[PDB]
Coordinates of C-alpha atoms in Angstrom, one line a residue:
Chain Q
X1 CA -53.6 12.0 -47.1
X2 CA -52.5 11.0 -43.6
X3 CA -50.0 8.4 -45.0
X4 CA -47.7 11.1 -46.4
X5 CA -47.6 13.5 -43.4
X6 CA -46.5 11.1 -40.7
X7 CA -43.9 8.3 -41.2
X8 CA -46.1 5.3 -41.9
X9 CA -45.6 3.3 -45.1
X10 CA -47.6 4.3 -48.2
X11 CA -49.6 1.6 -50.0
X12 CA -46.7 1.4 -52.5
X13 CA -44.1 0.6 -49.7
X14 CA -41.9 3.6 -49.0
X15 CA -41.5 6.1 -46.2
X16 CA -42.4 9.3 -48.0
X17 CA -41.7 11.6 -45.2
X18 CA -38.1 10.4 -44.8
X19 CA -37.7 10.8 -48.6
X20 CA -38.8 14.4 -48.4
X21 CA -36.0 15.1 -45.8
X22 CA -33.2 14.4 -48.3
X23 CA -34.6 17.2 -50.5
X24 CA -34.2 19.6 -47.6
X25 CA -30.5 18.9 -47.4
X26 CA -29.5 20.8 -50.7
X27 CA -31.2 23.9 -49.6
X28 CA -28.1 25.8 -48.6
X29 CA -25.8 25.5 -51.7
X30 CA -22.7 24.4 -49.8
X31 CA -20.4 21.8 -51.4
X32 CA -17.9 19.7 -49.5
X33 CA -15.1 17.4 -50.2
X34 CA -13.3 15.0 -47.8
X35 CA -10.2 12.9 -48.4
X36 CA -8.2 10.4 -46.3
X37 CA -4.5 11.4 -45.9
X38 CA -1.8 8.9 -44.8
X39 CA -2.0 10.0 -41.2
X40 CA -4.6 12.8 -41.2
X41 CA -7.8 13.7 -42.8
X42 CA -8.7 16.9 -44.6
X43 CA -12.2 18.3 -45.3
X44 CA -12.9 21.5 -47.2
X45 CA -16.3 23.2 -47.7
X46 CA -17.4 26.4 -49.3
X47 CA -18.4 29.2 -47.0
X48 CA -20.8 31.7 -48.6
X49 CA -21.6 34.8 -46.5
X50 CA -24.5 36.5 -48.2
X51 CA -24.9 40.0 -46.8
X52 CA -22.3 42.6 -46.1
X53 CA -23.9 42.9 -42.6
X54 CA -23.3 39.4 -41.4
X55 CA -20.1 39.0 -39.4
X56 CA -18.0 36.6 -41.5
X57 CA -16.5 34.8 -38.4
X58 CA -19.7 33.3 -36.9
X59 CA -20.9 31.7 -40.1
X60 CA -19.2 28.2 -39.9
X61 CA -20.0 24.6 -40.9
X62 CA -17.2 22.8 -39.1
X63 CA -17.9 21.8 -35.5
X64 CA -15.4 20.5 -33.0
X65 CA -16.9 17.6 -31.2
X66 CA -13.8 16.4 -29.3
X67 CA -10.1 16.5 -29.7
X68 CA -10.4 13.3 -31.7
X69 CA -13.5 14.0 -33.8
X70 CA -14.3 16.9 -36.1
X71 CA -17.6 17.2 -37.9
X72 CA -18.6 18.9 -41.1
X73 CA -22.4 19.4 -41.7
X74 CA -24.4 19.7 -44.9
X75 CA -27.8 21.3 -44.6
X76 CA -30.0 23.8 -42.7
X77 CA -28.2 25.3 -39.8
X78 CA -30.9 25.1 -37.0
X79 CA -30.8 21.3 -37.3
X80 CA -26.9 21.5 -37.6
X81 CA -26.7 23.0 -34.1
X82 CA -29.3 20.5 -32.8
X83 CA -27.3 17.5 -34.1
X84 CA -23.9 19.0 -33.0
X85 CA -25.1 19.6 -29.4
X86 CA -26.4 16.1 -29.1
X87 CA -23.1 14.8 -30.5
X88 CA -21.0 16.6 -27.9
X89 CA -23.1 15.2 -25.1
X90 CA -22.6 11.6 -26.3
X91 CA -18.9 12.3 -26.8
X92 CA -18.5 13.4 -23.2
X93 CA -20.8 10.6 -21.7
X94 CA -18.8 7.9 -23.5
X95 CA -15.5 9.1 -22.0
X96 CA -17.1 9.1 -18.5
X97 CA -18.6 5.6 -18.6
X98 CA -15.9 3.7 -20.4
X99 CA -12.7 5.7 -19.6
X100 CA -11.1 6.3 -23.0
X101 CA -11.9 8.6 -25.9
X102 CA -14.9 7.9 -28.1
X103 CA -13.7 6.4 -31.4
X104 CA -15.1 7.8 -34.8
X105 CA -17.2 4.7 -35.6
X106 CA -18.9 4.6 -32.2
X107 CA -20.0 8.3 -32.5
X108 CA -21.3 7.6 -36.0
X109 CA -23.2 4.4 -34.9
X110 CA -24.9 6.3 -32.0
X111 CA -26.2 9.0 -34.4
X112 CA -27.7 6.4 -36.9
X113 CA -29.6 4.9 -34.0
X114 CA -31.2 8.1 -32.8
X115 CA -32.0 8.9 -36.5
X116 CA -33.8 5.5 -36.8
Chain O
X1 CA -7.5 -0.1 32.4
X2 CA -4.2 0.9 30.8
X3 CA -4.4 2.3 27.3
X4 CA -1.2 2.7 25.3
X5 CA 0.1 6.2 24.6
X6 CA 3.6 6.1 23.3
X7 CA 4.5 2.9 21.5
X8 CA 7.2 1.1 19.6
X9 CA 6.6 -1.4 16.8
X10 CA 8.0 -4.8 16.0
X11 CA 10.7 -7.0 17.4
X12 CA 12.0 -9.8 15.1
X13 CA 14.2 -12.8 15.9
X14 CA 15.6 -16.1 14.9
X15 CA 17.8 -18.9 16.0
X16 CA 20.7 -20.4 14.1
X17 CA 23.4 -22.9 14.9
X18 CA 25.6 -21.0 17.3
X19 CA 23.2 -18.5 18.9
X20 CA 20.3 -16.1 18.3
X21 CA 19.8 -12.8 16.5
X22 CA 17.2 -10.2 17.6
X23 CA 16.4 -6.8 16.1
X24 CA 14.1 -3.9 16.8
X25 CA 14.0 -0.2 15.7
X26 CA 14.3 3.0 17.7
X27 CA 10.9 4.7 17.4
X28 CA 8.4 6.0 19.9
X29 CA 5.2 7.0 18.1
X30 CA 2.4 9.0 19.8
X31 CA -0.4 8.4 17.3
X32 CA 0.4 10.1 14.0
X33 CA 3.2 12.2 15.4
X34 CA 6.5 10.3 15.4
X35 CA 7.4 12.0 18.7
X36 CA 10.6 10.3 19.8
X37 CA 13.4 9.5 17.4
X38 CA 15.8 7.1 19.2
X39 CA 14.3 5.1 22.0
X40 CA 16.4 2.0 22.5
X41 CA 14.1 -1.0 23.0
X42 CA 16.6 -3.8 23.3
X43 CA 18.0 -4.0 26.9
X44 CA 20.9 -6.4 27.5
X45 CA 20.5 -8.1 30.9
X46 CA 23.8 -9.6 31.9
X47 CA 25.9 -10.6 28.8
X48 CA 24.1 -13.7 27.5
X49 CA 20.5 -12.4 27.4
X50 CA 18.8 -9.7 25.5
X51 CA 15.2 -8.8 26.3
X52 CA 13.4 -7.0 23.5
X53 CA 10.2 -5.2 24.5
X54 CA 7.6 -3.5 22.2
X55 CA 4.3 -1.8 22.8
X56 CA 3.8 0.9 25.4
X57 CA 6.9 2.9 26.3
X58 CA 5.7 4.0 29.8
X59 CA 5.8 0.3 30.7
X60 CA 8.9 -0.6 28.6
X61 CA 10.8 1.5 31.1
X62 CA 9.0 0.0 34.1
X63 CA 10.1 -3.5 33.1
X64 CA 13.6 -2.2 32.6
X65 CA 13.6 -1.3 36.3
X66 CA 12.6 -4.9 37.5
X67 CA 15.3 -6.3 35.2
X68 CA 18.0 -4.2 36.5
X69 CA 17.1 -5.1 40.1
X70 CA 17.0 -8.8 39.4
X71 CA 20.7 -8.7 38.4
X72 CA 21.4 -6.7 41.6
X73 CA 19.5 -9.3 43.6
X74 CA 21.4 -12.3 42.3
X75 CA 24.7 -10.6 42.9
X76 CA 24.2 -10.9 46.7
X77 CA 26.0 -13.8 48.3
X78 CA 28.8 -16.1 47.4
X79 CA 30.7 -15.2 44.3
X80 CA 29.7 -18.7 43.0
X81 CA 26.4 -16.8 42.4
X82 CA 27.8 -15.1 39.3
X83 CA 30.4 -17.7 38.2
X84 CA 28.3 -20.8 37.5
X85 CA 24.9 -20.1 39.0
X86 CA 24.6 -16.8 37.2
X87 CA 21.2 -15.9 35.7
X88 CA 20.3 -18.1 32.8
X89 CA 17.9 -16.7 30.2
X90 CA 15.2 -19.3 31.1
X91 CA 15.1 -17.8 34.5
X92 CA 14.7 -14.1 33.5
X93 CA 11.9 -15.2 31.3
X94 CA 10.0 -17.0 34.0
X95 CA 10.1 -13.9 36.2
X96 CA 8.4 -11.8 33.5
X97 CA 5.9 -14.6 32.7
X98 CA 4.8 -14.7 36.4
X99 CA 4.6 -10.9 36.5
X100 CA 2.4 -10.6 33.4
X101 CA -0.1 -13.2 34.5
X102 CA -0.7 -11.5 37.9
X103 CA -1.1 -8.1 36.5
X104 CA -3.9 -9.2 34.1
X105 CA -5.7 -10.8 37.0
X106 CA -6.2 -7.4 38.6
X107 CA -7.5 -6.2 35.2
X108 CA -4.5 -3.7 35.0
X109 CA -2.2 -5.0 32.4
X110 CA 1.4 -4.2 31.6
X111 CA 0.8 -3.5 27.9
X112 CA 3.8 -5.1 26.2
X113 CA 4.9 -8.0 24.0
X114 CA 8.3 -9.3 25.1
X115 CA 10.9 -11.6 23.5
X116 CA 13.7 -13.0 25.6
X117 CA 16.6 -14.1 23.5
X118 CA 19.6 -15.8 25.0
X119 CA 22.0 -18.8 25.1
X120 CA 22.1 -20.9 28.3
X121 CA 25.1 -22.2 30.3
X122 CA 24.1 -25.6 28.9
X123 CA 25.0 -24.4 25.4
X124 CA 21.4 -24.4 24.2
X125 CA 19.4 -21.8 22.3
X126 CA 16.6 -20.2 24.2
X127 CA 14.1 -18.0 22.5
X128 CA 10.6 -17.4 23.9
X129 CA 7.8 -14.8 23.8
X130 CA 5.3 -13.5 26.4
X131 CA 2.7 -10.7 26.2
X132 CA 0.1 -8.8 28.2
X133 CA -2.1 -11.8 28.4
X134 CA 0.6 -14.2 29.5
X135 CA 0.6 -16.5 26.4
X136 CA 4.0 -18.1 26.0
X137 CA 5.4 -20.0 23.1
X138 CA 8.9 -20.9 21.8
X139 CA 9.7 -21.2 18.1
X140 CA 12.7 -21.2 15.7
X141 CA 11.7 -17.6 14.9
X142 CA 9.6 -15.0 16.7
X143 CA 8.0 -11.7 15.9
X144 CA 5.7 -9.3 17.8
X145 CA 2.9 -7.0 16.9
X146 CA 2.8 -6.0 13.3
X147 CA 5.8 -8.2 12.3
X148 CA 3.9 -11.3 13.1
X149 CA 1.9 -10.9 9.9
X150 CA 4.8 -9.8 7.7
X151 CA 8.4 -10.4 8.9
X152 CA 7.7 -13.9 10.2
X153 CA 6.7 -15.4 6.7
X154 CA 10.0 -14.2 5.4
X155 CA 12.3 -15.6 8.2
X156 CA 10.3 -18.9 8.4
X157 CA 11.6 -19.7 4.9
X158 CA 15.2 -19.8 6.1
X159 CA 14.7 -22.0 9.1
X160 CA 11.4 -23.9 8.8
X161 CA 11.8 -26.8 11.3
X162 CA 14.1 -28.0 14.0
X163 CA 16.6 -29.8 11.6
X164 CA 17.5 -26.6 9.7
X165 CA 18.9 -24.9 12.8
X166 CA 22.4 -26.6 12.7
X167 CA 22.7 -25.7 8.9
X168 CA 22.0 -22.0 9.0
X169 CA 25.1 -20.0 9.8
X170 CA 25.6 -16.4 11.0
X171 CA 26.2 -15.0 7.5
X172 CA 22.8 -16.3 6.3
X173 CA 20.9 -15.2 9.4
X174 CA 22.3 -11.7 9.8
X175 CA 21.3 -11.1 6.2
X176 CA 17.8 -12.5 6.6
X177 CA 17.1 -10.1 9.5
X178 CA 18.5 -7.1 7.8
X179 CA 16.3 -8.0 4.8
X180 CA 13.3 -8.2 7.1
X181 CA 13.9 -4.7 8.4
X182 CA 13.9 -3.6 4.8
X183 CA 10.4 -4.8 4.1
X184 CA 9.1 -3.3 7.4
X185 CA 10.4 0.1 6.4
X186 CA 8.4 -0.1 3.2
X187 CA 5.2 -1.5 4.6
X188 CA 4.8 -0.1 8.1
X189 CA 3.7 3.3 9.3
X190 CA 5.4 3.4 12.7
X191 CA 8.9 2.2 11.7
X192 CA 12.0 4.3 11.0
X193 CA 15.2 4.0 9.0
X194 CA 17.3 3.4 12.2
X195 CA 17.3 0.1 13.9
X196 CA 19.4 -1.9 16.4
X197 CA 20.5 -5.5 16.2
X198 CA 22.0 -8.0 18.6
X199 CA 24.0 -11.2 17.9
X200 CA 24.3 -13.5 20.9
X201 CA 26.9 -16.1 20.1
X202 CA 28.0 -19.0 22.3
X203 CA 31.7 -18.4 21.4
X204 CA 32.1 -14.6 21.3
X205 CA 29.4 -13.5 23.7
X206 CA 27.2 -10.5 23.1
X207 CA 27.8 -8.2 20.1
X208 CA 25.5 -5.2 20.3
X209 CA 25.4 -3.1 17.1
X210 CA 23.5 0.2 17.4
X211 CA 22.2 2.4 14.6
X212 CA 22.5 0.1 11.6
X213 CA 20.5 1.7 8.8
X214 CA 18.4 0.1 6.0
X215 CA 20.1 0.6 2.6
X216 CA 19.5 -0.6 -0.9
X217 CA 16.0 0.7 -1.4
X218 CA 14.3 0.2 -4.7
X219 CA 12.3 3.2 -5.9
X220 CA 13.7 3.1 -9.5
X221 CA 10.3 1.9 -10.9
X222 CA 8.3 4.6 -9.1
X223 CA 8.7 7.4 -11.8
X224 CA 6.7 5.4 -14.3
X225 CA 3.6 4.8 -12.3
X226 CA 1.2 7.6 -13.2
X227 CA -2.5 8.4 -12.9
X228 CA -4.9 6.5 -10.7
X229 CA -6.4 4.5 -13.5
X230 CA -8.2 6.3 -16.3
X231 CA -5.8 9.2 -16.4
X232 CA -3.6 9.4 -19.5

């Protein structure tokens, strides 16, 4: 019972709760594709606006972190904004304490460690 | 107490084989304000001595009075007085040395560094320095105030010791001085673009050139330097 709610191992040897998170991802029905150019990168994603009432401009999945870094999100949008806001803060703080722009790799590695 | 109000900056000098060169700029500065443009600080005394005085201007002019009277004094009595007993440099210097010591013993100093540059009747180079304390020393090359930390390392290269003096000619020395002024105008707050320069030779007497200007200033590199570090 209380081995599958919190993040401790199960008797088998797997973090159930983490595994349940990946099934939460495909709950928006967005698909995305991302390719490396020769000097650029391009990322397209579908943008389904359900109701006529929604204003089509505010619905977005592409977030500008810095001049250098763009970010496209797959999943539920509350957690989108929560991970995008934390990303922006780390992007600014890096620039301040080391004096150049945050590379792509270093922003990716900082998120994996908060995720852990 | 005397505190300086108006001041001038450095005086720089050096011997060579036939005489001495001595240079100093024309600026009276009153704190930040560069109040007086053109205040001549080299005063020729006779025709084989220059006395260059830096530091306070109120007192620069008060030592100009004593030095004009000393010439008038000697003139009295037999014309032999100005033919072959005329005032050597080594005299004029000893009169300012004895004046400076006495003033400081009343705790009321004449607030000046002084360089007496001349060539004696004997043929010899004479170049000595005195200041508000009364310290005296003679060297191949002499500088005052701020130029003691800057100009002097540059001129000491040319003539390092006593044996280099009969090798250095007037073409080499005149350049070495004019090159020192160039570095003082980069790296000193109280200096100006206009300086004066004197060549005392033992064959053509006193040549006094006024209002020589520093030229050939390198700023070509300056348009590339950008930001204060982290700025792109």
